[PDB]
Write a protein that binds this ligand. Structure first.
Ligand code: NA
Length: 100
């Protein structure tokens, strides 16, 4: 068995084809087992509609999830990603790194 805690990165990207669009991305990388729960949060509340959840694996024991959706961030809200995984004794909430 192997278990590896996800790395979690929360960042925004504008698709170049539509710079008015902005995606909130939670990139959950390098984890095993694959079992995982990942939410984007706005002011602590899970964003229910997350348009994209792209899961891949490299080695059989390393999974990668890009969980992302369009958003329109303002300064008045806090955006984050919450991940639960067996490696994490508590849900990990990672705030949007507005510089990343
Ligand atoms: Na957890």
């Amino acid at each position: 068995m192997i278990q590896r805690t996800p790395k979690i990165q929360v960042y925004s990207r504008h698709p170049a084809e539509n710079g008015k669009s902005n995606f909130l991305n939670c990139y959950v990388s390098g984890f095993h087992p694959s079992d995982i729960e990942v939410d984007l949060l706005k002011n602590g509340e899970r964003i229910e509609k997350v348009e994209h959840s792209d899961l891949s694996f490299s080695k059989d024991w390393s999974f990668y999830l890009l969980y992302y959706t369009e958003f329109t961030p303002t300064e008045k809200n806090e955006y984050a990603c919450r991940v639960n995984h067996v490696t994490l004794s508590q849900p990990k909430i990672v705030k949007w790194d507005r510089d990343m």
